[PDB]
Symmetry: D3
Subunit: 182 residues, 6 copies
């Protein structure tokens, strides 16, 4: 934001109760929702209609961010949260990391964390200890989704590099948390 | 509100980035949602259950308002926002005007602006330059909806007078913006 | 909350326009929603994913709370709100009491108020004057739901004791309102 | 069908186990379904897309017909079936009559029977003994729906005359059954 | 059916391409559908509205039967089919057995087969080789569902005895197939 | 089907009332339905669960076939039917051609016809006279969908060659109709 011009609901949510391993995710896009991309406006405390997805492709898992984090790209750490039923847009969930999906787009690197709810919240996912426990068919779907959903956004492209584990996820959380407080 | 008694989430959203032509709409009622009327409480920053619609008729397009506007009737400027998928109640969208629907009810005039998302947000609607580009079948549906949805609200009635264009829409935005700051 | 650590959107909603008989309910769980339990975080002003319900059972009526009340268990007064269509999670509704469902769980007593919207809001429910007007099949469903939904939460149990009327509901509202202001 | 040209799944369903009081209804349009009108093709044994409803108005109750009946207008006896959840299009339900809605359109009289499932099938509706037990708000909605849904079908109109009871319903069933066998 | 009275779409579907291990299931009730019980009428070739479930509980997995089988209770072999998205009521699916749920009701034994689609049809479930691979939380849900869904059907009760494996499933298929041809 | 082994509901539906221009389409997959591929079994008269789509991608328009046609690949002529609301799986619709999408897969050519309902059925689409009237964003989505939906079916691939008009569509109908009667 420009000098001249520069002259709550989200930013007051703790990044996590016990970082980096125990963190909070505000949901922006439910799994399987109609192909509209919402992005939290953290100044306004509201979800903003970002884009009607050109390919009409839908998020195969829930999509959100960790409040009070600032990633290298200037946005909060992004998280995919797997659940047995879609989560409400604008809700918050206690989560734990399984790893990450490494990718780069026309603008630089872009990693999305892969997460599940805390075990007490979601017993259905407690079995998932790391990225490699996530079913092959689903990891494939997610990789395909990121490779293709922006196929019809002019000037954009996405390349998926592959997966990473929990340390890598935690470093991302660690650094994002740091950056947000300068 | 009475003298004796008179002794954020919505009202801090800018009316628009470049008024009157580029404005923001907070969504109250998604297109095709079950026949319950919500109204934003701008004091409380929450959607309020206003009415279970007597006829059970549903909004054929998304319905919302422009924050920080005050129309002659004492409420913000109302907007119908056409999209290819319903929008989330309580989300905000960047919009542009196509015109208006002129009508009057038992309480006086009532015009609803007709709008679509900004072109970058919704490429699907970029083709729509003015009210006359909106399909006849849909304009008819909208006119019918406003004529009939309140058919079973005792003491109420609505009469649709016809359509108007972008200047008329902009004047409404212009005046609403002015009124809100006294 | 511990001494050491202790060193808006919900709590600024009035408990009611004319207590105890005319009160407000913020909706946490819509009737018939997928089996995920949300709980309002009144500090954060957001709905939190509380639990994926083990039995996968769904709320047969809308579920919420009255802001600015504090019940003996340390939480706001809980309310079941019957409507002909599910209400939006995080919306507020003007309600009136029909009575209560008395029950106890592993932690102590737990009563849920049973309510409907104000007559002007919902003409469909205006016929319901007291708990005994609520259809037998539905009261049975609600009692069954509370008896069984937590069947697969380890260490938990719920026993339903039976119904009570409007005075009992009002006393609950009365006391909850009092407790919240010390 | 013309002489020259004239040279199972539905027509083999009994009209009823104990006519006229105990009859069967094949569902064509579920309550609250998207505004598309289906009509059973009794020759082909399939539902046919009849019309995208111009007003976009939806059936407030389930809509179907009694197989092996032929009403004066050349079609089977029509039935509105009230249920607590919409019924599957193309399913069959055991029903009992509450009465009828008398109306006429541009083509002549048109009465729709009003029905509910057999008590053992639907205990929720067992309380409804006659047309006058059906809630006022719902009867009003149904009358409004028939008055308005065809508002935007060119050359069509519908006028609702009022209600009738079970004898009238039974006579309709009685005659329809007779006519179908010459 | 009585002597005096006794004087296609389903019954012409093969029980299986390679019995007992490779069999067909016609779906009657999709997983998570609204709490209405459908039952295929094999004489009429249509789904019949059987019951509005008193508890309002929903099937946690898809429910159907194997055509051209006759189980001891006089009905076809029943099957629960697990899939990542609910299946269409009245569709047919190629399936393979994982085992069975043994239970008895007021009328005698009642076993439900547990199945998944053929691997080529559903790669998502190919990992499931036997009943013990099905997640604990889901088996628990299914057992709870059968224990409770009929809680409010007067005169009925269900007791779940426990699980069994593929041989037991196959014997059920084997015998059902035999019985159907006398 | 092999010699040794070779020793209604769909095949008795006319291909069209006035071929090739006025034809019938039986719907197999509704627009926007969950990512499960159904295929009509024309022997059995039922929809069969064909595949859980690996990419989880959904049909952006309705998908079906013209009964009593046999295309070069051994299946009926395939049709994409555009409508303002998804159509019921297993319903039949009166349609007219806009053109075709030419593509080839690992098995040979594969063209899908693009169609809309008859004007009287769907006034919303009457404006569409040819393939070039279909919005660019939608044609792009459809082309992308066919290019990518099978990305995760092992051994499969699809290449889209481009569009064709009504004569080409009609020839396809013409030949398919011929082939079906030897
Ligand atoms: N989210 C989630 C989740 C966790 N376990 N499952 C799961 C696994 C296997 C089967 Cl057969 C069903 C559900 C999920 N869908
Ligand atoms: N909103 C919107 C929108 C913009 N274009 N369309 C559109 C137009 C024609 C067709 Cl066949 C489909 C969609 C919409 N539904
Ligand atoms: N909520 C509610 C409500 C109020 N009246 N009804 C109602 C009663 C009878 C019938 Cl047949 C339909 C709706 C409701 N579902
Ligand atoms: N169908 C139906 C039906 C029967 N009783 N009810 C009903 C009545 C009152 C209330 Cl409060 C809820 C449901 C229905 N919706
Ligand atoms: N049906 C099914 C099925 C098969 N695998 N899964 C599955 C397992 C784990 C996760 Cl995390 C998601 C889906 C299903 N839901
Ligand atoms: N199907 C269809 C169809 C036909 N016209 N439209 C349409 C076009 C423009 C707009 Cl703004 C909305 C709908 C459709 N969605």
């Amino acid at each position: 934001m420009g000098t001249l011009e520069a002259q709550m609901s989200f930013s007051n949510v703790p990044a996590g109760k016990d970082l980096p391993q125990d963190f909070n995710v505000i949901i922006e896009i439910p799994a399987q929702s109609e192909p509209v991309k919402y992005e939290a406006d953290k100044a306004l405390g509201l979800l903003v209609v970002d884009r009607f997805i050109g390919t009409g492709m839908r998020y195969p898992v829930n999509y959100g961010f960790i409040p009070q984090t600032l990633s290298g790209d200037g946005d909060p750490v992004d998280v995919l949260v797997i659940t047995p039923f879609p989560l409400l847009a604008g809700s918050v969930v206690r989560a734990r990391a399984l790893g990450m999906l490494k990718m780069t787009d026309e603008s630089g690197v872009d990693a999305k964390l892969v997460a599940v709810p805390h075990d007490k919240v979601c017993p259905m996912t407690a079995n998932l200890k790391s990225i490699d426990d996530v079913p092959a068919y689903l990891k494939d779907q997610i990789k395909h989704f990121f490779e293709q959903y922006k196929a019809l956004e002019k000037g954009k492209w996405v390349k998926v590099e592959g997966w990473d584990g929990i340390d890598a996820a935690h470093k991302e959380i660690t650094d994002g948390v740091a950056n947000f407080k300068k």
